[PDB]
């Protein structure tokens, strides 16, 4: 009952918050990495153009 | 804790069981808990008296 419910609730809240953090972390880093690799190509193109 | 444990189970399924109460009076009843203008008691508890 009561005390076990709280221990269960503490872990379930924590797991949801880390699972969210992990999903968002990869999504933010991955979008930026793809953008940074595209940027280097554009810079090289512009550098060659200049 | 009791409220929580009943609530989580989600059923009031009750099976009567035959305890051997040889030697005491069964089906005790009170005027504080009247069902149909007769003295009665909690339906699921069995008040034993002398």
Query: Three-state SS string across A23-49, please?
Result: HHHHHHHHHHHHHHHHHHHHHHHHHHH
End-to-end distance of chain B based on CA atoms, in angstroms? Answer: 33
Nearest CA in chain A to B6: A1
CB contacts of B5 in chain A (<8 Å) are 1
Nearest CA in chain A to B2: A1
* Nearest-CA distance A15 → chain B (Å): 22
CB contacts of A7 in chain B (<8 Å) are none
For A21, the token pair is 């953090």
For B32, the token pair is 């504080």
For A17, the token pair is 């918050």
Nearest CA in chain B to A5: B4
Query: How much is the CA Rg of chain B, to the nearest whole Å?
Result: 14
CB contacts of A1 in chain B (<8 Å) are 1-2, 4-5
- Please report the DSSP string for chain B in residue order: -HHHHHHHH------------TTSB-S--EEEEESSSSEE--TT----B-
């Amino acid at each position: 009952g009561r005390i076990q419910d709280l221990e269960k609730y503490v872990e379930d809240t924590k797991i949801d918050l880390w699972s969210y953090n992990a999903e968002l972390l990869v999504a933010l880093e991955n979008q930026h990495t793809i953008d940074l690799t595209d940027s280097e190509m554009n810079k090289l193109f512009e550098k060659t153009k200049k | 804790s009791l409220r929580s444990l009943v609530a989580s189970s989600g059923t009031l399924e009750f099976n009567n069981e035959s305890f051997n109460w040889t030697g005491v009076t069964q089906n005790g009843t009170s005027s504080a808990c009247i069902r149909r203008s007769n003295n009665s008691f909690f339906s699921r508890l069995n008040w034993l008296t002398h």
